Amino acid sequence: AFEALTGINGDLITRSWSASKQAYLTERYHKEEAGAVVIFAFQPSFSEKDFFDPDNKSSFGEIKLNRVQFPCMRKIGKGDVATVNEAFLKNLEAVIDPRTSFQASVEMAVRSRKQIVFTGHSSGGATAILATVWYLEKYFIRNPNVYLEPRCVTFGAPLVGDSIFSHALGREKWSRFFVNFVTRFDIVPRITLARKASVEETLPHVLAQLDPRNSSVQESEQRITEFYTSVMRDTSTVANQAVCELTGSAEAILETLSSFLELSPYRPAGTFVFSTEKRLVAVNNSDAILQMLFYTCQASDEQEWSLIPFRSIRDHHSYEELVQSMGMKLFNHLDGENSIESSLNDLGVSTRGRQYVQAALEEEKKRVENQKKIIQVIQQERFLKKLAWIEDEYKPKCQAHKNGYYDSFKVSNEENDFKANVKRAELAGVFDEVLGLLKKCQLPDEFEGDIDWIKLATRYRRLVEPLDIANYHRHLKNEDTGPYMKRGRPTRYIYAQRGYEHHILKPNGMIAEDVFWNKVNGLNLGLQLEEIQETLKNSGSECGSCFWAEVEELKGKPYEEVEVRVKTLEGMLREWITAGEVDEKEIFLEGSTFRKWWITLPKNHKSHSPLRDYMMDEI
């Protein structure tokens, strides 16, 4: 029942562990070729430098990922990039270094259609996690084969990424590739949950004790105990904060306290398997795992408290025993259990701790339910009719009046324009409601990647954002508040755009901003790139459904003042039309704001403009 869930068998686990051990004896990494499988095991490190980077000035040695090298590791709508341990990222960087032959070997394995596996013990496991993401970003997303699917298997690995990191893995459906084995008391997966200042004095001694090759430094009772106590204290604060935050209650007092709290950003990423003498417990839910990382490493009696710190060290060296006794242990999948009491009791989880775990699991079930409700709404006839009416009745009628539905809405002279406004408002309510759930993380991680949602939201944005732009300028909000693109654009449209852009661009490895700016310089304006970015700051030309926002901002202005923005808008137009972002039946109409304004442009521009053959001047 373990293999049909994790997608890995006892054979791969055993080979991964063997390679993980062998990695101790090599530079950076060890490659093990096992027939159809190629395993890359990474050398662990036990210096404090390799857990908290010395040059890192943050309280947890954390750093934001570069959006260029890890474009998927971010929130799509919100934009926020993921955060990882800097020391671990530097270690990955050191092995990707061309001189190590690591990348060449990876590419050799890809061409051979071999099953690629990344693995490691301790900090080596942390490197494996980052290497897997690197592989997923560089190769798998570019050509997703069943042959290209990696596997990541770790043993006693430190935590690596933050909640966004975990979220992004989930959205891309990459989380399934990750399995993290944790012996019950192992302190190493808990370490980075502590402030680096909390363990700055005792970490070097403890790491020396954790090092399997270091039987030199004499064991110290005091240092190990202080270390365990420090890690558990900070861990409890993180876990308790997560408890209060997950249920959405007491947001006021928590916000007040947030100014005075330093909590670790690091979160479980991928499946975690907790191990005891008699049990293997697999958990998928990151929130649930976070709680378990605290409550599984507690004392049973109050007499055992003196023993636990030493067991937290020894359990890091008990993965040999884990791997050898795998088939003899009882397995269960916590998330799928009808009752989680038995599993967590063997993991020594208290009654209160079990309820915290249960709440985390229930919250995910809520998110699934919320998505089901959304599907029911957007598939209803009464909902779809609103979009259909705009598309099949309102737009053609406005085209027949020769001014278009943007201009018709803006002046709103007829009952149909007021009817369009109602449907604009009603659609806004439904998409704002979805956005609200997303902002509060009350939908599954995969939601923004769901192609059915992306299809609908894209259809919505292209159809109705022009109307919301019209509404904005109709009520002169451009004069009161300012430009639509700067202070007026509804977040729901921004989410829709980014969800769409990510979907279509990510198999080609480029991001929207890069695609946009590459096209701008291709227009041959000759000006300095730095100068043009200043002019195109908050331009409506980055998104086809913002066509009208840009037109509004450019009309009325002298030509010299906004010459650059004009030629940019013209250069984006045909692709916008081809992609369906802009309707060609609308913008060139006689009564169209765009057409009426375009004619008033200087004749020198119109002659060699690509739009000359699509509009004729008046007489």
Binding site: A250, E255, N421, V422
Partner: protein, 524 residues
């Protein structure tokens, strides 16, 4: 036996442990120990740490007989240091006299300190104010004072008190219940602590400490149930209290520190607060949708030459169209429901929080009133009621006009001097009441048998008054052109007024007879 712990019980536990393991209580109490021992007035010391700035307050010993001695503070009182803390519902509240007297007698050095602290918060460096017993009371008063004009974007200060007596009364409790300020207070008390709560009431969050752990209670009703007694208990040694909390963290005691029925209360009130939200995000969109429907309705009534005022009134008297019925029963009622609640919500918040909420609904509230109050007027007079403006206006309409009817009216009229007025909502939202009143005057003059000649002269003056009123708003372009729609109650008024005023002429008379109104409200 026992049944599994409730949701709220687990929150208070986790929040309690979070506060304990945070080290905030320890660092606060240790600095408190320093100020009492390395004439008897208020004392304070400022600790400027790396993470934050800590201010410790120290006061003379608590006088027990002055337990329920209170000082009343009114918004009208110029000697009230907290005018922005008063609300419309509660224009006054009461404070513990010894605490308040210590606070005011130190107004000089506390004003100097306020400069530094506000500047500290501006640099996004958080601030803690703390004190034990009566020092904690003054510390709380000082925190309330800092929050009086503070920028809501800045990080909120945190006030931590240890074994402090109660500070405010029911009035202040009710105010802070509707304020962000309430989340700036952490009152640490021993579980053995009892307080006579006959006059003074708890506000803020309470951390109740047991030997085996602690729990955060925000529900002031629960705090009352837990801490109210017939005797004010003395100050305990919180050095020992915190010590037992540290030993609690390494304990396997998941005991339920809070009684069964107390939890029942906290939950029931929690669920009722999750609904008192009125979803000012979701319902907010529901409002815009209903307003959009009204605007659609208004356009349709215009095109059939009746106007939405009279069409509404007509369908109210004789319902025959489903669309019109839906407009009244759902969309109008939804808008009335919303804006009444908005008015109520503004009135229960302290002026500081209320002013923010008022700015958010300035324009939209003004637009709602001018759009919808006409419809309530239609119903009012259809029901045969009289003198709407002075005797019949719904409270929320009056408040909305009171708040929003003076500022935006200057900028909007600026635009309505060159622009077309087709979409203009009549500024005087009681316009139609004036029309209905004048119609009543005319009917009295026409039908009342044996009316005295002096009474007739009075009513005739009313007619002239209304005509002057009408001509004024027409000339100032402050009325919707839709009043001239041929089936409207205004055009009926004119027809009836025309018959009764006879051969005399006026500016309005020529305006109507030459049909100059057909060119009224055009661009220029």
């Amino acid at each position: 036996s026992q049944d599994p712990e409730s949701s709220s019980s687990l929150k208070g536990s986790a929040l309690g442990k979070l506060v304990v393991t945070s080290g905030l209580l320890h660092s606060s109490w240790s600095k408190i120990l320093e100020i009492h021992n390395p004439d008897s007035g208020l004392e304070f010391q400022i600790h400027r740490e790396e993470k934050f700035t800590l201010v410790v307050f120290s006061a003379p010993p608590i006088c027990r007989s002055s337990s329920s001695d209170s000082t009343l503070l009114h918004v009208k009182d110029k000697e009230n240091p907290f005018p922005f803390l008063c609300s419309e519902n509660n224009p006054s509240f009461s404070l513990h006299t010894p605490a308040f007297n210590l606070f005011t007698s130190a107004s000089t050095s506390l004003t100097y300190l306020k400069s530094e602290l506000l500047q500290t918060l501006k640099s996004e460096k958080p601030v803690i104010i703390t004190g034990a017993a009566l020092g904690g009371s003054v510390a709380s008063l000082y925190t309330l004072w800092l929050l009086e004009t503070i920028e809501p974007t800045l990080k909120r200060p945190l006030c931590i008190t240890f074994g402090s007596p109660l500070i405010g009364d029911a009035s202040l409790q009710q105010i802070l219940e509707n304020s962000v300020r309430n989340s700036c207070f952490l009152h640490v008390v021993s579980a053995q602590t009892r307080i006579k709560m006959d006059f003074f009431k708890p506000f803020g969050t309470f951390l109740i400490c047991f030997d085996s752990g602690c729990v955060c209670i925000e529900d002031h009703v629960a705090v009352t149930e837990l801490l109210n007694g017939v005797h004010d208990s003395g100050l305990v040694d919180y050095s020992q209290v915190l010590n037992r909390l540290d030993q609690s963290m390494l304990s396997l005691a998941d005991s339920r520190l809070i009684p069964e029925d107390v939890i029942k209360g906290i939950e029931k009130r929690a669920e009722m607060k999750n609904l008192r939200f009125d979803m000012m995000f979701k319902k907010l969109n529901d409002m815009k949708i209903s307003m959009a429907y009204i605007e659609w309705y208004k356009k349709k009534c215009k095109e059939v030459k009746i106007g939405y005022y009279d069409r509404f009134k007509t369908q109210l008297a004789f319902p025959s169209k489903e669309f019109d019925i839906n407009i009244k029963n759902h969309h109008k009622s939804e808008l009335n429901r919303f804006w009444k609640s908005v008015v109520e919500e503004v009135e229960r918040r302290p002026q500081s929080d209320a002013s923010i909420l008022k700015r958010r609904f300035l324009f939209s509230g003004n637009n709602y009133r001018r759009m919808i109050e006409p419809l309530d007027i239609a119903e009012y007079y259809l029901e045969g009621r009289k003198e709407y403006r002075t005797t019949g206006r719904s409270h929320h309409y009056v408040m909305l006009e009171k708040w929003f009817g003076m500022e935006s009216i200057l900028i909007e009229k600026e635009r309505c001097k060159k622009r077309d007025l087709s979409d203009l909502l009549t500024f005087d939202s009681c316009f139609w009441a004036e029309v209905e009143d004048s119609l009543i005057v005319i009917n009295q003059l026409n039908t009342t048998v044996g009316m005295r000649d002096d009474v007739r002269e009075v009513l005739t003056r009313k007619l002239v008054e209304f005509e002057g009123y009408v001509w004024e708003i027409i000339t100032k372009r402050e009325v919707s052109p839709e009043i001239f729609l041929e089936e409207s109650s205004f055009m009926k008024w004119w027809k009836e007024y025309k018959k009764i005023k006879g051969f005399n002429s006026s500016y309005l008379t020529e305006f109507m007879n030459t049909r100059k109104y057909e060119s009224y409200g055009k661009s220029q």
